[PDB]
Subunit: 73 residues, 3 copies
């Protein structure tokens, strides 16, 4: 194995391209994860909203039951 | 520092292995993040479900209060 | 292009530093993604809590309507 200069030249080239190509894969996956998270934060914020809506309806029903429990008497 | 060919050979080897090993760490973390997100999307979908259940119960109570408010009169 | 030993020495150095610097960027982004997820798991757990609170209020209103529907008769 008299491993030469032009050979290591090529080994360096291809090694770097590999490591770079693998990096890029991780970058892409990372970008798609970011996007999933933006979507999930939105779904959580929408659920928060729905629940705000039920808090209000619940306030209303507690008031309507009050009116009736008292009027009944 | 008469930095030689067989020396850079070794430096190239170990450098690449490093960068590769570090890459693999990022890949693994990325995989565990993916899995956390799959779980979180499921928890959000289950919360959506629970809330669907409360929407229905709320429809029911609004109807039962109606029956009584009117019958009372 | 009589590409020499000291030249590839430099190319190796700078290539590695690059790939290392790019790696570090991915690591940082990965760390901030982890942190977003810790926050999102907390928001989901808090929503779970809010809903536990509405389950209880709903139990209460179903009981109060019961008392009245029956007393009315």
């Amino acid at each position: 194995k008299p491993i030469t200069l032009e050979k290591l030249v090529s080994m360096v080239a291809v090694g770097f391209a590999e490591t770079k190509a693998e990096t890029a894969t991780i970058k892409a996956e990372t970008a798609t994860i970011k996007k999933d998270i933006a979507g999930m934060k939105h779904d959580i914020a929408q659920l928060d909203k729905r629940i705000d809506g039920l808090d209000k309806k619940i306030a209303d029903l507690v008031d309507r039951i009050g009116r009736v429990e008292s009027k009944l008497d």
